[PDB]
Subunit: 283 residues, 4 copies
Amino acid sequence: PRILNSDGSSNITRLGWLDDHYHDLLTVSWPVFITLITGLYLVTNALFALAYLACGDVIENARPGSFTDAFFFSVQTMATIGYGKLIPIGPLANTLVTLEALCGMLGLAVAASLIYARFTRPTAGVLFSSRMVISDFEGKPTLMMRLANLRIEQIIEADVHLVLVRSEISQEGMVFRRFHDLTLTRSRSPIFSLSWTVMHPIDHHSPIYGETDETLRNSHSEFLVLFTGHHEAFAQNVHARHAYSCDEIIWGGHFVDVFTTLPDGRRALDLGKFHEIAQHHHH
Amino acid sequence: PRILNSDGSSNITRLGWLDDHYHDLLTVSWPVFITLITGLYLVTNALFALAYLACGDVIENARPGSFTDAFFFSVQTMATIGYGKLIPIGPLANTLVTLEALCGMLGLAVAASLIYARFTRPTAGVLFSSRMVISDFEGKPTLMMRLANLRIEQIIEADVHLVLVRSEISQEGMVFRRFHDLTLTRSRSPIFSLSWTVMHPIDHHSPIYGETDETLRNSHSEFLVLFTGHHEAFAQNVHARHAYSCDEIIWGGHFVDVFTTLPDGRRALDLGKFHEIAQHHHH
Amino acid sequence: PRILNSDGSSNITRLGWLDDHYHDLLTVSWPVFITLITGLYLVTNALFALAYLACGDVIENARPGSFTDAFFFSVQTMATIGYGKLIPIGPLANTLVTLEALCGMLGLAVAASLIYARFTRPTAGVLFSSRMVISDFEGKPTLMMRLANLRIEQIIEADVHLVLVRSEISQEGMVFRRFHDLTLTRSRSPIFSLSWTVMHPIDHHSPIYGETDETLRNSHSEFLVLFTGHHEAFAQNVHARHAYSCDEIIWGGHFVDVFTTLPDGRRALDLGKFHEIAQHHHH
Amino acid sequence: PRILNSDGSSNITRLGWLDDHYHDLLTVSWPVFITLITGLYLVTNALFALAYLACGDVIENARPGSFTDAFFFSVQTMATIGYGKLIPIGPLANTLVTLEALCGMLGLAVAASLIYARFTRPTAGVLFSSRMVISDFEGKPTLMMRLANLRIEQIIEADVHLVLVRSEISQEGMVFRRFHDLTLTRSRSPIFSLSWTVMHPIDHHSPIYGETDETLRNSHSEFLVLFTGHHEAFAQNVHARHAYSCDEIIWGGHFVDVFTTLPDGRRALDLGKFHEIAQHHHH
Ligand SMILES: [Cl-]
Ligand SMILES: [Cl-]
Ligand SMILES: [Cl-]
Ligand SMILES: [Cl-]
Ligand SMILES: [K+]
Ligand SMILES: [K+]
Ligand SMILES: [K+]
Ligand SMILES: [K+]
Ligand SMILES: [K+]
Ligand SMILES: [K+]
């Protein structure tokens, strides 16, 4: 019954047409988006066609009062194919022409931006260790997890937040969900390129100080990770979030190592070991 | 007589043609913007038409020395419909043609950017509690208000500023308007997704320490909120501002709660309670 | 003989073809940029024309082996006007056609981006007080200057740096130019909308502590201001820089005030007073 | 056998089709990218051609059941040249027409964004001193290197990180690679315009305190520099990274100076001296 999902998205039921047009257009599925555009496209040409007929027989080589002919003329006109069978006749016909044109291009201009707006979304090639571990490092127990960059490109000024979320009681006795950002021994990495093992020493300042497993379940406490950085691949900012539950903390565990020396004598990164955590079993 | 409006825009009278072209183009209303473009469009084609006539009878199937014909030819040419009745004749005619073309496309290129520039403005789906409240939390009186995200998408590295604005006297006795940023118990939220109740503990460091209501009215003091964050919906930064007056502070009040358990046993968010503030009435 | 100009640009002589293509294209003057594009345009069509002739007489209604005809055909083809007199003949002709097309549009795609890239540059509507002043505020002498927003739109999370630049001697006796960022009583303004008077208290920590005018000239010291913020007008970041010389510091001066009450009883901002500094003359 | 290359890219062997489409399209070489586009272009027209034939003899002046004719018609249609020899016949023909059109433009819209996305990548005109030096400045030994801006345009809010990377042993005896950000006497430069000499004083807090050369080789320690700032040229953010090995530290060295006075009496910047480091040789 987790508040937060693994993908880091909160797991709550929300209780609440043309209002949010721009968001909606970027939020819709490509199929749908394309449909909408299409609809709009067809629609407007039909409207234009009517405008033509409305004048009456103003297009060369058009079957008299036939909408199809007018419609297809309108497309050839608005897409500026301008084949040349169907042609404007008289001032009214042409004005509508020079109006459509502009309309068509403006539409392109609007379509483009939408396309580009929806199209240009990078994704940090970042992978999160499936588990966290609590274990002694440099003489203090430390909570850690680790990120691996999945692409050859590097992430610049990358940095990460480790946030504990759990239920608390106020002195006034208000029982709420609170967020604690957890001090990391290293929160910035100006050049993230291969793997980064993030650590929160646990000492008298850690909100998880002197806490066992049972105490963690008890406050229904989870751990939220936000990673962000500027990706050289996209020359644009990227982010990635992940969440862990009390039970994905492997106490006493140690992340295995991912840095190897090849037979060749060349250093390497093995991402098979990435999710592997060493453990002592005491019968 | 408030200095700051609810929308957060300052409420002052300012005392001050082609100077600010780019701003103006992004600032104008869509109707107007479209008009301007249109004007420009029509205009330039007329100019081009004249260029054609100026050569004299250089277009196939054009009524001799008729501007309409030339004009419409110019559009068919510049929009590149190129129907094919009206056609260039001779070097002069065509050079103008190949010039227009380029002109037309450049215009498209310019129109597009404007369109996209004006079109691509997101808006944080963020809603501000209509009121603030001053009340004891964890043993210190605290000023608070709260934000609710209005969309399913999440806001990353969101953060908020609570700024007190009020009149002060210098030792030198200059009576000015000063801004005090108010320390919040939590000013960053790397993953804002549902509701956030922001708090400024009031203690010996709060510029509103040991201040009653009467003292607040007296310094004609308001409270300004700036929220900002990176919206996953738009993959782009968003912001939202709000302002409160001395009298929108509900002393002793407590925001009601918006987190519920459904019959289903599924957690939920009710935004009807969002503006509701509990209060003790003592006859 | 100032190191830094008023516009904030350093005032030094630098001592140092296709190398920096992208920068150069955004850096060139519009006239030039347009020329380049034009050149490129004409050029490529000529090349294409030759390709056509090279096949030999492959265009309907083209004077045999005439470059003009081929050239103009090439434009009508690459701009996709496609009038219809000149037409491809045979596989070779048309392949070149379908190649040009694509070429043309790609060019548009490239032109557009350049245009948009160069076109979309906002400018903070920000005006800098022509002078600084050193005067007592709240019981410490303070260096100040002030910014006024020149537009109705607001600047968000605006902030400013006041940097002293002057010559110094190391213990080792290296005589260099050093930069001192000067602590401001207020360095962030989350919502900058009208005027902001920036202040650097001078106390035992100010690098300009117990410094007279003569001492300032002596270190050939200037003051550099960088302002930056997110402009609502453009929904994009803006910046502005300014520089002051030792002699634009008006000692004992006080900026006059720009906030007024109208006859109407409505508050206002007068930017005529903006550059005016009060002063005591002692015969 | 360096972990980090001079260009700042880590020097490790990584061990790991349509999966990463967007990255891949921005990552591919221009030749390849253009090819892909071309392929896609040709391909789709062929598909469309088949659609036409499939209806059977629906294009004016087309050799019966000939794919070439159909293909070339399809291009003239999708690029909207619309010459006018080949023309649609009947509802089926034209519907396909009005479909292609839209398709073509959408493709343009998609191509454009890619182009612009890949095209609009600035590069900080920044040059890194080929060496570092350790030498006494203001009475403490200091590690330094220096950056020179290579262009007339200025970089705003520029800042730099000096990161030591070397092997360490935990109390628990885990022998890992750790990153130490090194405190710089000056880490921000709001207006970087000519040269900046960055310094890390070495004192009891420097992770390189009381370290000789032999000790540096021994921890196989390198130094990584990340520079970033907002480039006025591009009105966009830029970055640059560099790395140094233990042996590119010139102990006792002093960077020569690059600031000169011309015969004219005008100040100047000489970038020939930029890589030159003074040194005392003691036989
Ligand atoms: Cl076990
Ligand atoms: Cl009451
Ligand atoms: Cl005087
Ligand atoms: Cl030697
Ligand atoms: K066309
Ligand atoms: K077009
Ligand atoms: K056409
Ligand atoms: K035609
Ligand atoms: K664009
Ligand atoms: K952009």
